Amino acid sequence: GALPPMTSSGSGPVIGDGDAALRQRISQQLFSFGDPTVQEVDGSDAAQFITAAAAVADRDVASVFLPLQRVLGCQQNSGAGFGARAYRRTDGQWGGAMLVVAKSTVSDVDALKACVKSGWRKATAGTPTSMCNNGWTYPPFADTRRGEEGYFVLLAGTASDFCSAPNANYRTTASSWPG
């Protein structure tokens, strides 16, 4: 039931590259556990951990990360990739990942939504020993044309206390996403 090793290359928050302003605002949407026993890596490092975790021999662990892996293919990139962070408890028995898409980077928001719903999964609260996943968007109507950024967030993890922290925050004002 082990997660693969998590290696950092110092990669920043956006898969591929992004403008400094984008990396900055993306990084302010990515959750951190602030926990010295939960290793965190970003961007391509996070994508590489997602892809490795989706392929582990243990199917119950791989299933946690499959929906994340499947929506990495939804990156519409010209253009930048998704924001990403992956999390691995030191014992390798707990973790997850979240993807953050900045609405202003998405050339075809309807296509992104359709791609995500092909690859994502129904929201699952899970339990302390079973996988969770959820998706949010905020603000409800991001008028990017008035300079208001919007974000799509997808997160999934090995246990309910992975998703519960960030879920609590979003549940206050964000909307379920996608339908």
Side-chain angles (χ1 to χ4, degrees), residues 1-47 49-58 60-121 123-144 147-170 172-179:
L3 294 165
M6 169 178 282
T7 175
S8 168
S9 68
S11 76
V14 177
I15 298 164
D17 215 64
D19 188 81
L22 172 63
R23 293 187 267 113
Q24 179 164 3
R25 72 182 170 271
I26 283 293
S27 73
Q28 304 174 352
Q29 319 305 309
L30 290 172
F31 185 74
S32 171
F33 283 85
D35 183 332
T37 70
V38 171
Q39 187 182 354
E40 296 175 4
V41 299
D42 300 357
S44 42
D45 292 345
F49 178 83
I50 288 163
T51 297
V56 300
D58 185 335
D60 270 327
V61 175
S63 172
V64 168
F65 293 89
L66 281 176
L68 293 158
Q69 168 73 5
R70 298 194 293 235
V71 296
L72 288 179
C74 294
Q75 286 171 111
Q76 302 185 356
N77 56 315
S78 48
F82 296 169
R85 174 165 295 162
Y87 314 72
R88 182 186 187 276
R89 201 166 66 194
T90 185
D91 63 348
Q93 296 288 319
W94 183 102
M98 72 172 290
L99 304 173
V100 174
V101 189
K103 184 178 162 192
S104 67
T105 70
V106 177
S107 278
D108 189 345
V109 175
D110 278 1
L112 169 65
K113 192 190 274 222
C115 184
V116 168
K117 198 77 221 77
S118 323
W120 196 234
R121 184 180 282 163
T124 316
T127 75
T129 62
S130 57
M131 71 191 62
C132 63
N133 68 271
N134 216 324
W136 306 92
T137 189
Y138 62 91
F141 160 50
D143 185 356
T144 57
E148 175 179 56
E149 182 67 275
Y151 294 97
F152 314 98
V153 183
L154 303 166
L155 70 148
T158 58
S160 50
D161 61 331
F162 173 82
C163 301
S164 78
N167 273 357
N169 306 347
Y170 299 119
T172 68
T173 59
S175 285
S176 274
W177 188 93

